[PDB]
Design an enzyme around this catalytic site. Structure first.
Site, PDB file in Angstrom:
ATOM      1  CG  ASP A 134      -1.832   1.087   1.346  1.00  0.00           C
ATOM      2  OD1 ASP A 134      -1.555   2.195   0.856  1.00  0.00           O
ATOM      3  OD2 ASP A 134      -2.863   0.894   1.981  1.00  0.00           O
ATOM      4  CB  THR A 135       1.927   3.601  -2.590  1.00  0.00           C
ATOM      5  OG1 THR A 135       0.683   4.080  -3.069  1.00  0.00           O
ATOM      6  CG2 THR A 135       2.332   2.467  -3.454  1.00  0.00           C
ATOM      7  N   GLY A 136      -0.111   4.199  -0.042  1.00  0.00           N
ATOM      8  CA  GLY A 136      -0.774   5.266   0.689  1.00  0.00           C
ATOM      9  C   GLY A 136      -0.434   5.332   2.156  1.00  0.00           C
TER      10      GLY A 136
HETATM   11  N1  LIG Z   1      -7.187  -6.759   0.884  1.00  0.00           N
HETATM   12  C1  LIG Z   1      -7.905  -5.842   0.758  1.00  0.00           C
HETATM   13  C2  LIG Z   1      -8.760  -4.756   0.603  1.00  0.00           C
HETATM   14  C3  LIG Z   1      -9.973  -4.688   1.334  1.00  0.00           C
HETATM   15  C4  LIG Z   1     -10.856  -3.595   1.122  1.00  0.00           C
HETATM   16  C5  LIG Z   1     -10.508  -2.581   0.180  1.00  0.00           C
HETATM   17  S1  LIG Z   1     -11.512  -1.201  -0.159  1.00  0.00           S
HETATM   18  O1  LIG Z   1     -12.920  -1.516  -0.342  1.00  0.00           O
HETATM   19  O2  LIG Z   1     -10.865  -0.491  -1.261  1.00  0.00           O
HETATM   20  N2  LIG Z   1     -11.693  -0.063   0.909  1.00  0.00           N
HETATM   21  C6  LIG Z   1     -10.638   0.839   0.980  1.00  0.00           C
HETATM   22  C7  LIG Z   1     -10.657   2.047   0.241  1.00  0.00           C
HETATM   23  C8  LIG Z   1      -9.563   2.911   0.311  1.00  0.00           C
HETATM   24  C9  LIG Z   1      -8.418   2.588   1.081  1.00  0.00           C
HETATM   25  C10 LIG Z   1      -8.387   1.365   1.805  1.00  0.00           C
HETATM   26  C11 LIG Z   1      -7.155   0.962   2.609  1.00  0.00           C
HETATM   27  C12 LIG Z   1      -6.583   2.091   3.506  1.00  0.00           C
HETATM   28  C13 LIG Z   1      -5.441   2.748   3.087  1.00  0.00           C
HETATM   29  O3  LIG Z   1      -4.898   2.306   1.923  1.00  0.00           O
HETATM   30  C14 LIG Z   1      -4.889   3.762   3.885  1.00  0.00           C
HETATM   31  C15 LIG Z   1      -5.511   4.060   5.084  1.00  0.00           C
HETATM   32  O4  LIG Z   1      -6.676   3.410   5.551  1.00  0.00           O
HETATM   33  C16 LIG Z   1      -7.177   2.458   4.741  1.00  0.00           C
HETATM   34  O5  LIG Z   1      -8.191   1.958   5.080  1.00  0.00           O
HETATM   35  C17 LIG Z   1      -4.992   5.145   6.026  1.00  0.00           C
HETATM   36  C18 LIG Z   1      -5.250   6.613   5.644  1.00  0.00           C
HETATM   37  C19 LIG Z   1      -6.013   6.869   4.386  1.00  0.00           C
HETATM   38  C20 LIG Z   1      -5.278   6.580   3.104  1.00  0.00           C
HETATM   39  C21 LIG Z   1      -3.827   6.060   3.246  1.00  0.00           C
HETATM   40  C22 LIG Z   1      -3.655   4.526   3.443  1.00  0.00           C
HETATM   41  C23 LIG Z   1      -7.276  -0.455   3.213  1.00  0.00           C
HETATM   42  C24 LIG Z   1      -6.514  -1.596   2.541  1.00  0.00           C
HETATM   43  C25 LIG Z   1      -6.072  -1.095   3.908  1.00  0.00           C
HETATM   44  C26 LIG Z   1      -9.502   0.506   1.740  1.00  0.00           C
HETATM   45  C27 LIG Z   1      -9.291  -2.665  -0.533  1.00  0.00           C
HETATM   46  C28 LIG Z   1      -8.424  -3.746  -0.321  1.00  0.00           C
END
Ligand SMILES: N#Cc1ccc(S(=O)(=O)Nc2cccc([C@@H](c3c(O)c4c(oc3=O)CCCCCC4)C3CC3)c2)cc1
Lengths: 99, 99
Positions: free
Chosen positions: A25-27
């Site tokens: 996760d680059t975020g």
């Molecule tokens: N495996 C899996 C998986 C499960 C659900 C999802 S989802 O539906 O896209 N929901 C979803 C939508 C958008 C982001 C995310 C992630 C997420 C981040 O990357 C970051 C942060 O909190 C997060 O929840 C912290 C601060 C904000 C941004 C920076 C980093 C989740 C994967 C960890 C999930 C995606 C992947």
């Protein structure tokens, strides 16, 4: 290598003697792994995300073998739903974003 | 271009005519954006984040300019900490992970 983003970039990490898969996760600033037993001392802290904050335990300089390469640095342990490898470790194995 | 992960991979996006700051998040499947007026009809959605789930409004066919490159896809509008650009729109610009 080069990884396409059609699918979740999930890799296999070796940590604390256990194999686990994680998402690159680059975020994320830090690395958050699910609740497990790791040796050492830790300071408790709260990280926030989409949905809110979760309480976690910060352990310092832990070694992780993310996809064939070793990397050392902080690892936050807690009630995360997915194991996430963040920026603080992605820079150690030379990861870049290209487009 | 090529982005190293030593700092938050923040980019300037152009949506709805306004300029906004967004984070490139490879772990995120969909693009989540803070609250704003977008055109069309929407559907309801729940996305799971680290700290829990949140409710979002899904808009399709939204034109969006990710630092120069214009993609056209689904955007989810909700109560997020920062605007995220997920894989749905990151594959459109040809973005990959390398190491
Ligand atoms: N495996 C899996 C998986 C499960 C659900 C999802 S989802 O539906 O896209 N929901 C979803 C939508 C958008 C982001 C995310 C992630 C997420 C981040 O990357 C970051 C942060 O909190 C997060 O929840 C912290 C601060 C904000 C941004 C920076 C980093 C989740 C994967 C960890 C999930 C995606 C992947």
């Amino acid at each position: 290598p080069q990884i396409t983003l059609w699918k979740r970039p999930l890799v296999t990490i070796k940590i604390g003697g256990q194999l686990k898969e994680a998402l690159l996760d680059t975020g994320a600033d830090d690395t958050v792994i699910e609740e497990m037993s790791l040796p050492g001392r830790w300071k408790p802290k709260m990280i926030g995300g989409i949905g809110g904050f979760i309480k976690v335990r910060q352990y310092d300089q832990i070694i992780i073998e993310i996809c064939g390469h070793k990397a050392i640095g902080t690892v936050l342990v807690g009630p995360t739903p997915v194991n996430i490898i963040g920026r603080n470790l992605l820079t150690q194995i030379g990861c870049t974003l290209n487009f």
